Amino acid sequence: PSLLKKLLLA
Amino acid sequence: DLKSLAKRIYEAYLKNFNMNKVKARVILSGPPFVIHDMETLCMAEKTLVAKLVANGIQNKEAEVRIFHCCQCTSVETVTELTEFAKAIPGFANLDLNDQVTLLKYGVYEAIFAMLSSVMNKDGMLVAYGNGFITREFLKSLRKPFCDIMEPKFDFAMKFNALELDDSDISLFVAAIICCGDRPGLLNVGHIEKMQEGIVHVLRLHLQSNHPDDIFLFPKLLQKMADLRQLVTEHAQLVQIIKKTESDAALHPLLQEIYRDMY
Ligand SMILES: CC(C)(Sc1ccc(CCN(CCCCC2CCCCC2)C(=O)NC2CCCCC2)cc1)C(=O)O
């Protein structure tokens, strides 16, 4: 779960 | 309607970016604090990034302190770009992994395009509109740090001569993000179709908003290609810094964006 994907899921 | 696509994208841009071109020009016309030498750099640090030098890392070289502040700004801008992307009609219907890929390759092209809105020939507005760093001061930094911003000023001076407004730039940034030729996309066709819609709206919008410049659309296609090259070169310099500079460690999010990029 990359940090970019984390931002997208925020 | 395509007019609705253009307005929705513009509204998403006004909502999600703290700095826009009208605001920046209002400030850049006249009171941001001017950073033009080491004395004023240190003063600005104590007023605008107090925690950074509360102790702190202020025994690190000025160039390294500036680089850290720049990284923090980029981390913030990636968040704003991600929220903007999520508001581009159709982007949220893409595969989540494709959404990651589009952001990964598009963010720095979008950053350097948007940086133009805060630059003039003498310097750039920074720190949420509260500082202004001179172009000459940045050129005066020791190598390699003096080599980061100058190509971006060169890009910005020509980009700014196109006299775009935020309604144009919002569509241009959307076009940069929704790019079907990024490496590793899963659903290229769906992304190309989405890109085609945004580019179609961009072409029509420029015809309406810039009736005086019959070549503005192909000029902007060329600017997109110029930005890809600018980003490739920028990433190469970032790698020189990460390799030769011990105090210049990259924030994990930026490391992730740069990894396996170019
Ligand atoms: C960080 C790398 C590794 S290199 C890099 C990348 C980008 C930049 C431009 C950062 N910046 C000056 C931020 C200057 C902060 C200021 C420094 C002096 C003390 C007071 C605070 C700025 O204003 N950016 C805008 C944000 C509004 C939207 C457009 C972009 C500089 C270096 C990266 O690749 O990310």
Residue numbers in the entry:
A (entry chain B): 687 to 696
B (entry chain A): 202 to 231, 237 to 468
Kindly provide excerpts from the paper associated with this entry.
Peroxisome proliferator-activated receptors (PPARs), composed of the α/δ/γ subtypes, are ligand-activated nuclear receptors/transcription factors that sense endogenous fatty acids or therapeutic drugs to regulate lipid/glucose metabolism and oxidative stress. PPAR forms a multiprotein complex with a retinoid X receptor and corepressor complex in an unliganded/inactive state, and ligand binding induces the replacement of the corepressor complex with the coactivator complex to initiate the transcription of various genes, including the metabolic and antioxidant ones. All four coactivator peptides contain the consensus LXXLL motifs that interact with the activation function-2 (AF-2) helix 12 upon ligand activation, whereas the two corepressor peptides contain the consensus LXXXIXXXL motifs; we investigated their positions in the cocrystals. The same applied to the interaction of PPARγ-LBD and the SRC1 coactivator or the NCoR2 corepressor. These structural findings support the idea that the agonist-induced formation of the AF-2 helix 12 induces the dissociation of the corepressors and the association of the coactivators.
We have succeeded in obtaining 14 PPARα/γ-LBDs–SRC1 coactivator peptide cocrystals and aimed to obtain more with the other coactivators: CBP, TRAP220, and PGC1α. Next, utilizing the same seeding procedures and the PPARα full agonist GW7647, we obtained the PPARα-LBD–GW7647–TRAP220 and PPARα-LBD–GW7647–PGC1α cocrystals and ascertained their structures (respectively). GW7647 bound to the same loci as was previously reported, PPARα-LBD–GW7647–SRC1 cocrystals. In PPARα-LBD, the α-helical LXXLL motifs in the four coactivators were located near the AF-2 helix 12 that was formed upon ligand binding, whereas the IXXXL portion of the consensus LXXXIXXXL motif in the NCoR2 coactivator was located in a position that interfered with helix 12 if present. In summary, the coactivator preference of PPARα-LBD was presumed to be CBP >> PGC1α = SRC1 > TRAP220. We also revealed the structures of the unliganded PPARα/γ-LBD–NCoR2 corepressor and PPARα-LBD–CBP/TRAP220/PGC1α (/SRC1;) coactivator cocrystals utilizing X-ray diffraction. These findings provide the molecular basis for the mechanisms by which the coactivator replaces the corepressor and the coactivators compete for the very limited surfaces of PPARα/δ/γ-LBDs.
